[PDB]
Amino acid sequence: GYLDWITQAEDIDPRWNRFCRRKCRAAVKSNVFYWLVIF
Amino acid sequence: ESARREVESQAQQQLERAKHKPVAFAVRTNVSYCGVLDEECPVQGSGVNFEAKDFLHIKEKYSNDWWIGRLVKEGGDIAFIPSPQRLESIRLKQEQKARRSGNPSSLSDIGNRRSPPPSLAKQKQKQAEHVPPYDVVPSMRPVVLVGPSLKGYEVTDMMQKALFDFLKHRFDGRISITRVTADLSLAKRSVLNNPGKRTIIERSSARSSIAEVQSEIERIFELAKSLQLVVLDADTINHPAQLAKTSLAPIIVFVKVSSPKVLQRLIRSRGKSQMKHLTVQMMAYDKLVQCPPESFDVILDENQLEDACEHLAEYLEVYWRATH
């Protein structure tokens, strides 16, 4: 819970990469991706 | 006596017509004085006994003895707060209740040495410090971020980066986050009549940063005046002790990481920019964990970003709800 917390700080603009990472990171923790991979 | 009846409701009508009166300023109290024991007040009844470290928002100017202010608890109402002088005058009465208030002991010695209370037994003396019972505080308590290590380091700057980001989105339209790069350690409520008023003095303080240290104090003061949440995240705050005696008296948020072993692998994964001062992070937490728990205003020991965010957000709205 701490390595990703500081990683969440990297996702914030102080590049398109951080916007790319931010969208994909929340995509995994969506409660729909989990059921999709289960299916 | 019909004179008291008219003046009793004179304040009642004046303070009821406009229930949207702007908050002129706020004050803090730290004296255990009971406002109900002394049956003396503009409106007779049972006055509010606001205890130590309770903020009173004085929004009206009645006279030089009692002032109208509101407290910072939920469901606050319109109350009265006597002047600090008045409190100094009435604090002197507290020692008057005893048999003697000066030097002469009453140990079976009456009628031989009267010893009336001289100027040394009054409030004229004790002027070397003469700490006032009331202290100036901003409209709302500022929030600053400390821990889990010294500020300016990789992780500590990283932990606040995600935390401050959440506040502006959740509290949009009510918050203002500012960054000040100037020192704040040397800031006391009474050090001089006019610290660094003139920069052409060419003395021990003219060339120092005190010429701009006082300027930012009003900047925080004016930020609170505009009725919005203020955030202070300077590089000069690393412990709540030094800021516990200034005029600001802010809110200290704690992000303790529980065992010191966690911090280690948190910084070890960063890169070669960290082990150049890897060891001082332990004493950075060690010199910060020894502080008594009651000094901190909130605790965030949760290991998840989301849970700690909702833990802090719930406290701020209660402060927001109370002061409205």
Side-chain angles (χ1 to χ4, degrees):
Chain A
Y2 277 175
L3 297 182
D4 65 335
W5 191 359
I6 72 168
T7 317
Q8 277 290 103
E10 308 248 12
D11 281 3
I12 311 162
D13 44 350
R15 193 170 201 270
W16 276 255
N17 184 22
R18 304 309 186 183
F19 163 76
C20 172
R21 180 156 219 173
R22 192 174 61 240
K23 267 302 198 64
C24 293
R25 269 282 300 288
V28 170
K29 299 159 27 195
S30 44
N31 205 276
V32 165
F33 154 79
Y34 163 67
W35 280 133
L36 160 86
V37 69
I38 285 285
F39 171 77
Chain B
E1 182 199 11
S2 176
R4 50 170 202 146
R5 270 187 256 105
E6 194 260 332
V7 79
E8 170 86 2
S9 297
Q10 175 62 33
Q12 264 174 333
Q13 190 58 254
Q14 192 82 261
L15 317 193
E16 211 273 338
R17 290 170 173 169
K19 279 296 289 176
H20 280 220
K21 196 71 65 73
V23 173
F25 52 96
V27 84
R28 204 170 56 136
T29 180
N30 45 3
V31 185
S32 56
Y33 156 68
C34 295
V36 299
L37 196 144
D38 306 313
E39 271 273 328
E40 196 198 19
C41 46
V43 173
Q44 274 89 25
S46 284
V48 52
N49 199 347
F50 37 91
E51 295 303 320
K53 312 293 199 223
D54 195 285
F55 281 59
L56 274 306
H57 278 56
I58 329 184
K59 56 102 179 179
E60 285 270 39
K61 304 215 199 328
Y62 184 82
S63 85
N64 304 324
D65 47 21
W66 298 70
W67 297 323
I68 321 91
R70 85 173 290 155
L71 77 164
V72 285
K73 100 168 182 68
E74 213 282 328
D77 310 321
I78 285 167
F80 261 81
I81 302 97
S83 104
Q85 162 271 321
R86 166 87 163 108
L87 201 76
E88 278 280 337
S89 174
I90 205 164
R91 183 158 65 170
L92 191 139
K93 183 253 171 181
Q94 292 181 358
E95 289 94 12
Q96 289 222 7
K97 201 69 81 180
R99 44 200 83 93
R100 288 292 166 267
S101 58
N103 49 358
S105 183
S106 278
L107 205 61
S108 289
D109 306 311
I110 311 169
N112 212 317
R113 252 80 169 175
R114 278 188 194 149
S115 191
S119 70
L120 307 161
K122 273 189 195 161
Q123 219 55 45
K124 167 205 165 197
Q125 278 324 111
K126 301 198 175 203
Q127 271 213 1
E129 277 169 340
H130 211 148
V131 184
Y134 285 75
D135 42 346
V136 57
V137 294
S139 168
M140 66 154 256
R141 287 171 47 73
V143 289
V144 317
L145 194 143
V146 78
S149 181
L150 283 196
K151 274 278 186 82
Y153 287 127
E154 258 185 272
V155 176
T156 304
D157 258 347
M158 282 295 217
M159 312 279 268
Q160 54 91 38
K161 260 184 67 178
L163 256 186
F164 286 144
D165 210 39
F166 174 79
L167 329 182
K168 56 156 78 56
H169 276 200
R170 186 48 71 80
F171 289 134
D172 202 343
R174 312 165 155 207
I175 202 177
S176 193
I177 294 100
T178 60
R179 165 87 161 85
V180 287
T181 59
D183 192 9
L184 205 62
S185 71
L186 269 298
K188 314 310 140 181
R189 271 168 34 83
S190 67
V191 279
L192 207 57
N193 280 110
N194 215 350
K197 177 56 82 189
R198 307 274 173 249
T199 58
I200 61 171
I201 293 173
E202 192 63 30
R203 259 179 55 245
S204 301
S205 186
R207 204 179 161 92
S208 53
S209 170
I210 321 297
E212 58 96 9
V213 164
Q214 188 60 259
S215 83
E216 61 208 277
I217 311 303
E218 202 72 28
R219 297 220 75 235
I220 311 156
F221 285 180
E222 61 76 10
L223 214 54
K225 195 176 188 294
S226 58
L227 202 163
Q228 36 170 20
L229 300 165
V230 317
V231 152
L232 330 180
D233 46 42
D235 208 7
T236 180
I237 293 97
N238 282 296
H239 206 286
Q242 56 260 9
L243 268 79
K245 61 197 184 304
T246 79
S247 160
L248 292 161
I251 294 178
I252 307 297
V253 300
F254 196 19
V255 285
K256 185 187 93 204
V257 294
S258 301
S259 165
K261 180 51 212 75
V262 190
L263 174 137
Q264 196 20 75
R265 258 186 274 284
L266 267 186
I267 60 175
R268 187 248 179 175
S269 74
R270 298 315 304 123
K272 200 167 181 177
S273 80
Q274 200 62 286
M275 325 76 75
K276 71 198 193 279
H277 36 63
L278 202 83
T279 181
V280 277
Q281 310 300 307
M282 305 310 203
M283 320 99 75
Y285 163 100
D286 208 319
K287 78 171 65 63
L288 195 139
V289 72
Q290 68 203 345
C291 193
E294 81 176 10
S295 168
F296 313 142
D297 289 292
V298 277
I299 189 42
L300 318 166
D301 45 357
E302 327 297 326
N303 301 118
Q304 301 273 320
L305 157 66
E306 263 296 322
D307 167 326
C309 275
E310 59 96 12
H311 203 47
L312 175 81
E314 178 279 311
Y315 165 110
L316 266 298
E317 52 93 6
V318 168
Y319 194 26
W320 186 269
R321 204 72 61 232
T323 67
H324 278 87

